């Protein structure tokens, strides 16, 4: 079973620190670049850090540089994030993610496998992606049209779409604006270029009512995400 499982999250005081871990299984961990992506309550997903397959190259979001350290142990199939001098802005679910990018094209910065996340609760120009509408209320069997607009042209059409079901790790649906990921049904179609991107779902099954979020990985780091569109069932009551 192909999986990523995070641990280490806890209630922590400001100025304190935690060591987060991610155990990978079902795949050859040492062949992949990895990442940490976090989501604060009510906020969009935020890329935190990436590390090469051999651990020799790493990147960080500007607000965590010098406080966070990513590392990995390929013999233990594990990824780590040491998070120090914690502040209110660090409270979030921290997800471990596997980079779907390959060396053939160099399309790094998007993720085909995520963990459910570990919780960090601290006691008390970047491309902006705007998704619309914020909420879509639909009937069984109806279709959905989701919009993702970027503040700058997204290089190489490096625009990904993810599905997030409650209680589940995010799942990659589309990469390169129009390519369906392995196992994604035909009813999910990605389209668009430049700054305007669209995800269409031709006929919603029960499992399709979920939050859908976009991400651009065309820029140099940081890679950025939209705030998501919640697709919900228009109830009869």
């Amino acid at each position: 079973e192909v999986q990523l499982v995070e641990s280490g999250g806890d209630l922590v005081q400001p100025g304190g620190s935690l060591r987060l871990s991610c155990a990978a299984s079902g795949f050859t961990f040492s062949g992949y670049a990895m990442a940490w992506v976090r989501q604060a309550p009510g906020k969009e997903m935020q890329w935190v850090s990436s590390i090469s397959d051999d651990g020799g190259t790493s990147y960080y979001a500007d607000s965590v540089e010098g406080r966070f350290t990513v590392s990995r142990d390929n013999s233990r199939s594990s990824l780590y994030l040491q998070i120090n001098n914690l502040r209110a802005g660090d409270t979030a679910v921290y997800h471990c993610a596997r980079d779907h990018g390959g060396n053939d094209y160099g399309d790094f910065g998007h993720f085909d496998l995520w963990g459910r996340g570990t919780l960090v609760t601290v006691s008390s120009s970047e491309i902006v992606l705007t998704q619309s509408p914020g909420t879509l209320s639909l009937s069984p069997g109806e279709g959905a049209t989701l919009s993702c607009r970027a503040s700058q042209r997204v290089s190489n059409n490096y625009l990904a779409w993810y599905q997030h079901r409650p209680g589940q790790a995010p799942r990659l649906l589309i990469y390169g604006a129009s390519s369906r990921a392995t196992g994604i049904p035909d009813r999910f179609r990605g389209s668009g270029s430049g700054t305007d991107f669209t995800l269409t779902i031709s006929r919603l099954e029960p499992e399709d009512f979920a939050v859908y979020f976009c991400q651009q990985y065309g820029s140099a780091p940081p890679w950025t995400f939209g705030q998501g569109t919640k697709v919900e069932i228009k109830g009869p009551f």
């Binding site: 670049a33 990436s50 090469s52 190259t57 990147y59 990018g101 060396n103 053939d104 160099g106 790094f108 910065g109 290089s155 065309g218 820029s219 140099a220 780091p221």
Partner: peptide, 12 residues
């Protein structure tokens, strides 16, 4: 290909 573009991401 000789090196990974992952080593050059700031050079996009």
């Amino acid at each position: 290909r000789r090196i990974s573009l992952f080593s050059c991401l700031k050079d996009r």
